[PDB]
Amino acid sequence: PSMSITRLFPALLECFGIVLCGYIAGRANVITSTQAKGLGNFVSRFALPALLFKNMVVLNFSNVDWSFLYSILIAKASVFFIVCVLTLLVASPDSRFSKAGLFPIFATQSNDFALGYPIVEALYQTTYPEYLQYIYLVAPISLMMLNPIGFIFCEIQKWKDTQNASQNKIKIVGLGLLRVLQNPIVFMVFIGIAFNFILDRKVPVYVENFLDGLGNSFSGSALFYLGLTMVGKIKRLKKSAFVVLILLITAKLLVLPLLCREMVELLDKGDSVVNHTSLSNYAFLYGVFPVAPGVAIFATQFNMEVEIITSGMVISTFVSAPIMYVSAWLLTFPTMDPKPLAYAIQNVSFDISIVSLISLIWSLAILLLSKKYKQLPHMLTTNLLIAQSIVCAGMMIWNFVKEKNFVGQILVFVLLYSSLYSTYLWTGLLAISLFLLKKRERVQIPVGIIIISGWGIPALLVGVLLITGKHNGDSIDSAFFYGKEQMITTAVTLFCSILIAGISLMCMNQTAGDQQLTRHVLLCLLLIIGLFANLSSCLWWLFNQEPGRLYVELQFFCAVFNFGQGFISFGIFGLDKHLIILPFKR
């Protein structure tokens, strides 16, 4: 495999578990403000400098592959230059240099030590341990090369408020470099190389043990402090600020990873094709790291646009987790034999379901604690969320009995795909429900027969599939548990669902309690996109049975939607707890 992709998911939970635990502790006021700074300064003053000093003093510069460095640095520099120039050309002159300083830093600075290292470590503990030393020397070098340019830009903006015709050019440059030296990670690296020759790579045993204690305490503490500070940082920004965050996070998580792997392609000679492929994959994964929390600190120190910088830092942190997981799996696929590749899709489907079900259980708790499920549309959403819960629960059961006794397989397959067809069908039925409510008529909106049709019809389709279908116990994938008839049944279920959902949403436009039409319509539109992917996948297979082309990436994303849709309904209904039940639960 050369990546150890199976250990990625446990690492991501452990890393974002501490962040979530910190956020929960901060929200519940378990940790006071005075303890927050006590933990905050310890990480920045003791845990981090000890970690940085420990690695660089024993680092062997003789065996360092500097080719990977220049590829990452130029990729970072290219993103820095692109963002800086673009934000200079079309930003308002009053706050043009402040944006030109922090925004390129935002799109290039990454959380390599606190969060990047555990994912990099878990993937490359054994296959490529030399990849671990890169992250400790890529990050500080990047900070001393690009941040001075960004820091100088903020000094220009600061001195503009001071007026005085923007003089003291040497002072503006001087303060820019000075702030970089004052950064703990910059000078403690310089001390690391300093002691790398003075003390030599060998270090006293008692010193080494002391540095291990503080060093191993950084990642856990920094991640906990990360989520601790997230409390009350996301504000309802304007549309212009909302669009900018889309572009800035895209530059960090999409443009930067693509540039990092393309520069490695031509910088790195790659005598071994296998080693070249691993380096290119690692370069892609390094680019998709969240914005470092230290960028938000720079905004507060400079008193510039903290709100957009802090919100982007927090959002990019959570957004990167799906991107890190999905991208790392898709990079492995071109080097998978079709049979182990089948296990790869099942492995992704399994662990997406377990995180999705937790979101669905919370979403059901929010929706059923109140009397929302009494209401006409939210009753329809409740049925859809129950269907999604069984689909996620069915995949967990299916994973353990996919290669076991026949009687066990047939019960789980009925359980899994009767609910899966319901989620396809509930998308259309929910869209019909929105049409009736939007039409605003005296009609009684017969939810009684809707619920029967929502669950009964998928049961009939499964029953028809069983009496007319060919069993495959060898089939690892549940989509091919039956023959082409299952794809015909799946395509028919998807096909009819799209029209009834598509037409109903269209009729709402022609037509134009506490029912959220905008939230429900958004949910239906997002679900339909997943129906397009699944319908395309089924039609592609029927015309061409042979896989291997972009089908394999299409199959991966289809499996992501079928069991990840719960996350799509928790983003909408799970998150917005507000006070609809907060007094109720209190």
Ligand SMILES: CCCCCCCCCCCCCCCCCC(=O)O[C@H](COC(=O)CCCCCCCCCCCCCCC)COP(=O)(O)OCCN
């Ligand atoms: C203010 C709103 C903030 C917007 C947030 C999003 C902004 C930028 C979006 C995402 C960054 C770009 C990367 C994701 C797009 C998909 C491409 C990608 O890199 O991920 C792929 C799919 O990964 C995913 O599953 C991504 C989806 C998961 C996260 C969703 C992204 C956007 C979510 C929006 C969040 C909104 C925040 C609300 C703010 C109030 C897999 O990568 P690959 O290119 O196939 O790798 C192999 C190439 N050799």
Ligand SMILES: CC(C)CCC[C@@H](C)[C@H]1CC[C@H]2[C@@H]3CC=C4C[C@@H](O)CC[C@]4(C)[C@H]3CC[C@]12C
């Ligand atoms: C997404 C999957 C993995 C799990 C989702 C569950 C999350 C979103 C749930 C479960 C625990 C919840 C938290 C429990 C405790 C508190 C403290 C309270 O004073 C404010 C709400 C807050 C902060 C809740 C917010 C929502 C929460 C974080």
Ligand SMILES: CC(C)CCC[C@@H](C)[C@H]1CC[C@H]2[C@@H]3CC=C4C[C@@H](O)CC[C@]4(C)[C@H]3CC[C@]12C
């Ligand atoms: C590479 C792609 C994906 C994105 C690149 C990022 C660049 C182009 C983005 C990210 C930050 C953005 C800037 C952020 C805020 C402002 C101020 C506003 O008054 C006008 C637009 C302006 C000036 C934006 C222009 C576009 C911008 C510079």
Ligand SMILES: CC(C)CCC[C@@H](C)[C@H]1CC[C@H]2[C@@H]3CC=C4C[C@@H](O)CC[C@]4(C)[C@H]3CC[C@]12C
């Ligand atoms: C696809 C899976 C297996 C890989 C991603 C790992 C997990 C840890 C990811 C997937 C989606 C992520 C969630 C995305 C958004 C939020 C909202 C935020 O306010 C609380 C954390 C939370 C809930 C994230 C927690 C981490 C998360 C649950």
Ligand SMILES: CC(C)CCC[C@@H](C)[C@H]1CC[C@H]2[C@@H]3CC=C4C[C@@H](O)CC[C@]4(C)[C@H]3CC[C@]12C
């Ligand atoms: C698991 C496979 C076999 C199919 C699922 C079984 C079906 C028949 C079950 C599971 C989900 C169930 C529904 C879940 C939610 C509701 C809404 C509630 O206000 C009345 C009961 C009702 C309408 C349930 C009726 C029975 C039901 C439709």
Ligand SMILES: CC(C)CCC[C@@H](C)[C@H]1CC[C@H]2[C@@H]3CC=C4C[C@@H](O)CC[C@]4(C)[C@H]3CC[C@]12C
């Ligand atoms: C191959 C499968 C998906 C066949 C599709 C059957 C579904 C989409 C159809 C068949 C019968 C239809 C129902 C028949 C009549 C009504 C009454 C109307 O006032 C509300 C919608 C409702 C309740 C329809 C909803 C959609 C429905 C359930």
Ligand code: NA
């Ligand atoms: Na940078």
